[PDB]
Structure 1
Amino acid sequence: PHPKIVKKHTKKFKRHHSDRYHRVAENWRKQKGIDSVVRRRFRGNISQPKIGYGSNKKTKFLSPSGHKTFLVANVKDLETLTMHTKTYAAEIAHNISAKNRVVILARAKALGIKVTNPKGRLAL
């Protein structure tokens, strides 16, 4: 197995005053106003991003179920994962058709790789 996966901070950072205005969006950006409250970090305001939140190099990039993620298109591509079924799990880039997915599926169970997003575009 793996260590226990700890995010250190699980809440997406929002841009100051994002909600009070639409002409402002939700993608974090800095505050350069030297008067501003969010820049000088007054109590009770939003939390900047800062390096200390950087996660644990051991479990970094790990999806929760414990694997990592690797993004495949055709079967010839997932054959690179014959070795690592214990670390990487592979999922199927969105534009793949419903014709080839089912192929990546069957062959991806034979190899015994975990596909994070099966059930995409496939009924029974």
Structure 2
Amino acid sequence: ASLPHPKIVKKHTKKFKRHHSDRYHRVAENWRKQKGIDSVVRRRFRGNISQPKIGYGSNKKTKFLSPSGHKTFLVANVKDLETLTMHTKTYAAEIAHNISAKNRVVILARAKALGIKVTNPKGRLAL
């Protein structure tokens, strides 16, 4: 039901992890650049981890798009949901994590009436 788009390509689908985050527990795997003077990762030796750079950037016709073909838009209530009334084929709503269930049923009902896609229509639901 989305707008037609070219085939979505990710140039590097693997997550860039910090060197020796597997080695030490004190080293988190959020990316940091090696500024050492003898670092094999900084010197880009063969067989080491690759580094983030601008050449891995996604296509501008394809960027910020979900695999369904929409862009995620965070919503908190019905008035935030109603902003996507004329833009249903480009944006998909996502209910925020801190919305209660008795409000979530209202947002899902209004989105189903307006034809808006919700990317998480299963949070805090009881059965």
* TM-score (normalizing by structure 2): 0.96
Deviation per CA, 1:72-121: give whole Å up to 9, x if none. Answer: 00001110000110000010010000110000000001100110001111
SS at match of 1:38: helix
Structure 1 stretches of 5 or more lacking a match? none
Partners in 1 of 2:126 and 2:8 — Cα distance? 33
RMSD between superposed Cα atoms in Å: 0.6
SS at match of 2:24: coil
SS at match of 2:116: coil
SS at match of 2:74: strand
Partners in 2 of 1:9 and 1:78 — Cα distance? 33
Q: Which runs of 4+ in 1 moved over 4 A?
A: none
Deviation per CA, 1:52-86: give whole Å up to 9, x if none. Answer: 00100111000111111000000011100001100
SS at match of 1:3: coil
Partners in 2 of 1:79 and 1:119 — Cα distance? 20
Partners in 2 of 1:77 and 1:14 — Cα distance? 36
Partners in 2 of 1:64 and 1:7 — Cα distance? 11
Q: Aligned runs of 1:1-124 on 2, under 5 Å?
A: 1-124=4-127
What is the identity percentage for the equivalent residue pairs of Structure 1 and Structure 2?
Answer: 100
* TM-score (normalizing by structure 1): 0.98
Partners in 2 of 1:100 and 1:45 — Cα distance? 50
Partners in 2 of 1:123 and 1:56 — Cα distance? 40
SS at match of 1:69: strand
Partners in 2 of 1:30 and 1:83 — Cα distance? 43
Partners in 2 of 1:59 and 1:30 — Cα distance? 27
SS at match of 1:89: strand
SS at match of 2:106: helix
SS at match of 1:102: helix
Structure 2 stretches of 5 or more lacking a match? none
Partners in 2 of 1:99 and 1:19 — Cα distance? 43
Following superposition, the deviation at residue 123 of structure 1 comes to 2.5
Partners in 2 of 1:31 and 1:77 — Cα distance? 43
